[PDB]
Structure formats: C-alpha cells, structure tokens
Amino acid sequence: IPRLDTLILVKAMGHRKRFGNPFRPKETFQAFRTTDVGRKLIIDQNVFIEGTLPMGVVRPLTEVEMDHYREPFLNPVDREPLWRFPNELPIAGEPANIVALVEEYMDWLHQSPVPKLLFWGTPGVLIPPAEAARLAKSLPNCKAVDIGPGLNLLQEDNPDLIGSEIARWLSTLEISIGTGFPFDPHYVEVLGERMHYVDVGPRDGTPVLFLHGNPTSSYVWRNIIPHVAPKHRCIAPDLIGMGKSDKPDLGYFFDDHVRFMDAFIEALGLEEVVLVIHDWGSALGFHWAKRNPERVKGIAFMEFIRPIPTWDEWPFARDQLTEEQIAEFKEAFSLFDKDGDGTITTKELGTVMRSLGQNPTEAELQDMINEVDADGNGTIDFPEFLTMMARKMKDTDSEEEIREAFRVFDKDGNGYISAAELRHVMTNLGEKLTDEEVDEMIREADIDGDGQVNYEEFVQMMTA
Numbered sequence: 236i237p238r239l240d241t242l243i244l245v246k247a248m249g250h251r252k253r254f255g256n257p258f259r260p261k262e263t264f265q266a267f268r269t270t271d272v273g274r275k276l277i278i279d280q281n282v283f284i285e286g287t288l289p290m291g292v293v294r295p296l297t298e299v300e301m302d303h304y305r306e307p308f309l310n311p312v313d314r315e316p317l318w319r320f321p322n323e324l325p326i327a328g329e330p331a332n333i334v335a336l337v338e339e340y341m342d343w344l345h346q347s348p349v350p351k352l353l354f355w356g357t358p359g360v361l362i363p364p365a366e367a368a369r370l371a372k373s374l375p376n377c378k379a380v381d382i383g384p385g386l387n388l389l390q391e392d393n394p395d396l397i398g399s400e401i402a403r404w405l406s407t408l409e410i411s412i413g414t415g416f417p418f419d420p421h422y423v424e425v426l427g428e429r430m431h432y433v434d435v436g437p438r439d440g441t442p443v444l445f446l447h448g449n450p451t452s453s454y455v456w457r458n459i460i461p462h463v464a465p466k467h468r469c470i471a472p473d474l475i476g477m478g479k480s481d482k483p484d485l486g487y488f489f490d491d492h493v494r495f496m497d498a499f500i501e502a503l504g505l506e507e508v509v510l511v512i513h514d515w516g517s518a519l520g521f522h523w524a525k526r527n528p529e530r531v532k533g534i535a536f537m538e539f540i541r542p543i544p545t546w547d548e549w550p551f552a553r554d555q556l557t558e559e560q561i562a563e564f565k566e567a568f569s570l571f572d573k574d575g576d577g578t579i580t581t582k583e584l585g586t587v588m589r590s591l592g593q594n595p596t597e598a599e600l601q602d603m604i605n606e607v608d609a610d611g612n613g614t615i616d617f618p619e620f621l622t623m624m625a626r627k628m629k630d631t632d633s634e635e636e637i638r639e640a641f642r643v644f645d646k647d648g649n650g651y652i653s654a655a656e657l658r659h660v661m662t663n664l665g666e667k668l669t670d671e672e673v674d675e676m677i678r679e680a681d682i683d684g685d686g687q688v689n690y691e692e693f694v695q696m697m698t699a
C-alpha cells in the first residue's frame with residue numbers, strides 16, 4: 236500500500252503521457268558535469284557561450300559584445316576550457332582537490348589582514364546577497380559595495396560603479412557601457428606558450444592585476460580598467476586557452492591554470508600587486524595570495540569561487556515551485572479531495588485506494604496521512620501536499636521509490652505493466668489517455684517489444 240507521493244508521481248507520469256521521471260528539473264550545471272552530455276552541450280553546441288554567458292548578465296549583451304566573447308571559441312576544438320571549468324567547480328564536495336584548495340584559501344582569507352573590497356549584486360549567481368553580507372562581516376578589513384542588479388558578470392551590469400570604487404579604494408591603500416577594446420595587445424612567453432595581456436597605466440608603482448574567469452577574457456575588464464589606469468599600472472591577462480592567448484593541448488584543469496598564472500606573474504617580474512578578481516580568476520588569485528601573502532597589498536573581488544555545499548541552492552535550483560507546477564499539484568490534490576472541501580481525509584484516500592484495486596485498513600490510511608500531515612489534525616491540506624511534493628520532486632530517484640512506483644502501475648503484481656493495467660491505473664488517478672497515447676507510452680519503454688513494461692524497462696525510463 237503506497238505512499239501518497241508515489242501516487243502523485245504516477246499521476247504526473249500519465250499527465251505527461253510517458254514513462255520516466257516527470258519532475259526532472261533540467262538543472263543545467265549538472266548536465267555540464269555529466270559525462271558525454273556536458274561535452275555535447277558546451278563543446279559541440281557551444282551552450283556556455285550562447286546560453287550561459289548571456290544568462291550571467293542582467294542587461295542584454297549586444298551583438299558586438301557577444302562577438303568579442305565568441306571569438307576565441309569559434310572552432311569547436313578550442314572549447315576544452317569552457318567545459319573543464321564547470322567540471323572543476325567545487326559543488327557538493329566534488330572535485331575533492333578543488334574543494335580542499337578553495338577551503339584553504341577561504342580560511343587564509345578569514346585570518347588575513349589584507350584589505351578587501353567585495354562587490355556583489357542581486358540576485359547574484361555564485362555569491363547571493365545573503366552570502367555577500369555574511370562575508371562583509373566575517374572577513375577582516377572588508378568593504379562591500381552593492382552594484383544593484385547583477386548575476387555573474389557584474390562588470391557588464393555596472394562597470395562605472397565597480398571601476399570608480401576600485402579607484403577610490405586604491406588610494407586608501409599603502410602602495411605607490413562601451414563595447415570597444417582599445418588596448419594594445421602584449422604577449423609574454425609562459426611555459427613555452429604566449430599569453431596575451433593588457434598592460435596600461437604608469438610603469439612605476441604597485442600594479443593592479445585583473446583576473447577573469449569562465450567564459451570570458453580580459454575583455455570583461457574593458458570598462459573597469461580606464462578608471463584605474465590614470466593612477467596605477469593595470470595588467471589584465473587572458474588565461475591560457477582563453478581570449479587571445481595560445482591554446483596548447485591541455486586538459487585545462489585548475490592546476491594547469493595555476494601553473495600558467497604563476498609563470499605569468501614571474502615572467503612579468505611582478506613583486507607586490509593588488510588583485511582584482513572574478514569567478515575562476517578569483518580562485519587563481521586567492522590561491523596565489525595564500526601562497527604569496529607578503530606580495531598582496533589588496534584584493535578586490537566579486538562573484539568568486541567558494542565551496543557550494545549542495546546542489547539544492549540559490550545558483551542551481553530555487554525554493555519556489557512554478558505556477559504551472561502548483562496548478563498541476565492542485566489538480567492532483569483534487570483527485571483526492573473529491574468533495575472539494577480543501578482537506579483530504581482517510582475516507583477519501585480509501586476511495587482512491589479501493590478504486591486502484593487495493594483494500595487498505597483504517598490504520599493503513601491513517602498512516603498514509605501521518606506521512607504527510609504536518610500539524611497533527613489528521614487530514615491533509617494543500618500546503619502540506621505541496622510540502623510533500625517539493626520534497627518528492629528532488630529525489631524520485633531511490634530505487635525503493637522506483638519499485639514502489641512500478642508496483643502501482645503493475646496492479647496484479649506479476650512484474651509486467653500491461654496496457655490494461657495502465658489504463659485502469661491512469662483513469663483512477665484522473666488521467667484520460669486515448670488508445671494511441673497508451674500504446675505510445677508503452678511502446679517508448681518496451682524495449683523487448685512484448686507490448687508490456689517490465690521492471691528493467693521501467694527502471695531504464697526512470698533513470699535515463
């Protein structure tokens with residue numbers, strides 16, 4: 236005798252007219268990180284440049300801008316860094332090496348006196364406003380500046396404020412929207428390759444080194460550097476494999492970029508520097524700062540890498556069901572609440588359970604309610620129903636959960652879902668499938684072609 240949530244899942248499968256997980260959220264960075272899929276998206280279809288990048292800017296990028304970002308990646312074979320980077324992000328404790336190194340620099344950062352300037356935007360991507368506020372407290376000598384609306388490339392939403400702020404914070408330290416890229420291209424020899432960098436401003440003094448992330452280049456700093464360059468040397472390199480730098484055949488792991496950026500800094504002869512860093516540029520910068528803390532006179536940062544403990548969070552899912560989701564959940568609630576009073580009782584659950592062929596006792600039905608009732612009055616109202624389904628939607632994925640869903644379809648328990656069973660189960664859960672839809676739902680899953688759906692075949696649809 237199943238859980239209520241299992242019946243709502245089975246109902247949502249018949250609403251889609253297909254076997255398979257009906258709630259899978261698309262998710263997106265998870266696909267970037269799954270073998271074969273991620274590569275088809277970022278390498279073959281260029282999704283990181285064409286979808287992801289524009290979605291990191293509140294204002295629309297103009298075509299002229301899009302073309303600057305696209306340029307290094309025109310050839311599909313040159314896209315390895317775009318795909319390796321998101322597979323290096325420290326999420327849910329993986330990869331372990333990058334999580335460790337990132338935690339060690341965040342620790343160093345919490346104990347370091349180095350002056351800090353944190354830019355943040357609403358709603359952010361890597362650094363939600365709640366996280367921005369917590370850091371502006373906990374990190375020493377940290378000034379936080381609100382840029383207004385902002386996702387990831389805060390530079391592209393409010394360059395004038397970021398630039399002017401950096402120019403101001405720079406004079407408090409002890410140290411000596413355009414689409415064009417004026418800057419003269421410089422190159423330097425690094426580990427047998429040539430890396431491109433912008434190098435403007437006076438020759439003397441403490442330089443300001445700007446570090447971009449994925450999928451950008453020194454281009455992202457174009458409207459910030461003119462605020463700083465009157466007073467300080469501005470060095471803005473293009474990461475190896477990126478912008479106008481050479482593209483050796485590398486796997487483009489964080490540790491490759493660590494080596495190229497260390498050798499960049501040494502090939503320039505740089506001593507003490509101010510860092511201005513963003514996204515993977517922030518991981519490089521902070522990791523370098525931790526290793527060379529006497530050489531760093533200040534860090535300005537934004538939208539930086541920190542460990543993201545779980546996939547359930549303010550970048551990768553919201554806590555906010557859509558309106559269509561609520562409406563579909565309202566129809567599911569109505570199937571149970573047959574009298575329309577807004578509460579599901581044991582009798583009502585018994586009515587549905589007897590219509591599916593089963594014969595639950597009172598105590599079984601009470602317990603089915605005890606699984607969902609969040610206040611103790613012994614009936615289910617729609618907000619508890621939605622609580623139940625918000626959770627069901629994250630993991631329809633157990634194995635136990637899959638077997639339990641299979642059981643509701645396989646009404647006689649013989650290990651096969653027949654066409655007759657499908658129609659009876661869908662009708663009694665209020666889905667009204669035509670013959671062509673029933674045959675087609677079965678046909679999609681029925682790999683051996685016996686007209687039935689066995690366990691292995693159902694598991695294959697549910698985990699695809």
Ligand SMILES: CCCCCCOCCOCCNC(=O)c1ccc(C(=O)O)c(C2=C3C=CC(=[N+]4CC(F)C4)C=C3[Si](C)(C)c3cc(N4CC(F)C4)ccc32)c1
Pocket residue numbers: 263264280281282285286287288289290291360386387388448449450514515
């Ligand atoms: C270090 C980390 C920093 C990174 C900074 C940015 O991160 C912040 C945002 O992160 C969320 C990322 N979120 C997505 O990438 C996303 C999600 C959903 C979709 C979707 O399918 O709707 C999209 C999306 C597109 C989305 C927007 C597009 N424009 C808006 C511009 F005008 C062009 C284009 C595509 Si599209 C036509 C090239 C595209 C194609 C696509 N394919 C599946 C396969 F059949 C081809 C899938 C999704 C899209 C993309």
Ligand SMILES: [Ca+2]
Pocket residue numbers: 571572573574575576577578579580583
């Ligand atoms: Ca009722």
Ligand SMILES: [Ca+2]
Pocket residue numbers: 608609610611612613614615616619
């Ligand atoms: Ca209740």
Ligand SMILES: [Ca+2]
Pocket residue numbers: 645646647648649650651652653656
């Ligand atoms: Ca059966």
Ligand SMILES: [Ca+2]
Pocket residue numbers: 680681682683684685686687688689692
């Ligand atoms: Ca079969």
Ligand SMILES: [Cl-]
Pocket residue numbers: 320321322324449
């Ligand atoms: Cl990334």
